[PDB]
Structure formats: structure tokens, C-alpha cells
Amino acid sequence: PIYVRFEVPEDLAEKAYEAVKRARETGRIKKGTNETTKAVERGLAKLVVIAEDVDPPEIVMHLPLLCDEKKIPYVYVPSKKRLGEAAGIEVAAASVAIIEPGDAETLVREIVEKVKELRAKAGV
Template identity: 35%
Template sequence: MSERNVEESAVDASMSENAVVETITTERDEYELLCTMVNVIAKPLASRQLAKKLYKLVKKSSKKQRYLRNGLTAVQKAIREKGKGIVLLAGNVNPIDVYSHIPGLCEENKIPYCYVPSREQLGLLTGRLRSSIVVYIKPHADYQELFDEAYEAVNALVVD
């Protein structure tokens, strides 16, 4: 690899890290704007404070291998294993038929779920540059207290 390519890759890496930090936000105006773009089945939608807590949980769980399931098939498999966890679904997915069966699976297996407004932010939080429509978070000792708080808050949400 030439010296120029090494420098370019270092610049690209630093730019992508900055992009992740700048695009993931739970500011009031931006969050309300994202909430206006969700689809009709996105209920219960996480409040701004709960979304902030859930984003923090996703970021911590993504650092632990096998404690964050990302993608439709992996999440379906994790739900059917009937372990304790939280399911987060992106609210701005079209067509909704792609993942409309996931809330039913969660209710059947007594796993709490909620929607967050942006699939792009959900994907960036998992450490990928691609968007993610559904995420399953398993508990781990390193973030157990945060997981328990989020679990209770998501479990208390009421579907309208």
C-alpha cells in the first residue's frame, strides 16, 4: 500500500467517526422532525429521553460480541430462543410488510419492543454505515443497570 493510500484511509476513517458523532442526536427539534417521518405502525414510539437511553444501550451492547443481534433474520432467531432482551424497530421503514410481523412475535414471546424514529441512526449506533431496521439487545454484566432501566421503561409503554 502506498504512502498516499495510507493517508487517505486514515482521513476517511477519521471522517466517518466524526460523521457518526454528528449525525446521531436526540435534540428536541431534530427528534420531532424524525418522528413526523415514521410509518403508521410505529407504536409505541420511544420518547426523546427514552430514545437517548436506548441509543446509549445499543452503543454499549454493540461493543460486546453476541449481545446485539442486528438484522431481520438474526432478530427473529433470537426472539424464538426466548431469552431476555429488548427489541428496537426503526419507525421509518418502507414497505412496512418487511417487518410488520416482529411486534406479534415479541408479544407472543413476552419480549418488550418499541420503535425509534430513524433506521439510519440505529444502523450507525451498531457500528455500521448501513441502516438497520431491527435490533435485539441481550443483557450483559457491563451494562446491566442501564439494561434493567430500559427494559422496565420499554415494558411500561402502552400500545395505542
């Protein structure tokens, strides 16, 4: 999946799901590619979470490069279904932007630091 630019360890993906849930429950998130893209463009996203199994994939393919342009970190999770569950909706979500982490503050910081590690190693 060409828009999936680097591998993510399974336990970090779990942290990402849990960060989305906690931010949704106690903070503010955006759901879906249109509001995720706007939050990134506007510099409001603290962390973007992108599902690896979106089909058709075109709706998410621009997000990683846009995040990079805006210096906003992103991470991947395998399952749009699980990402939607975390985002508090009844169906799959392609992407989420965490705006206000709330009680997800620690997880978000942990995820950002760990993705920095992954990307330094991968060189992407």
C-alpha cells in the same frame, strides 16, 4: 406506520440507541430482521429495538406481535440510520436484538421498566 404501536419519548429513544451501542461494544447483539426474529423466536433477546422509518415496512411489521407472544420487550427509535450507527455498521438497521447487554445492563433495565409504563398507559 401501523407497526409502530405506541409513542416513545425522545429521551427514552436516546437511551435505546445508547443501549444498542454499549451492548454491541461490550456484549452481543443481532442486526437485521432475520436474526432479530430468530433471537426472539428462540427466547434469547432481552430487548428488541425497532426503527420507525423502515421502507418498505413489511420486513418489520410482524416483530412487535412476535415479541409479545414471546414476552420479550421492545421499543421503537425514530431513525434506522441512527440505529445502524449504534449497531456498529455503516448503514441503516431496521431492527436489533440485544442478546447480552454487557455494559448496557442498566440502560436495558431502565428501558424495559419505562416501556412497561408507556404500554400500561396506552393499553397496548
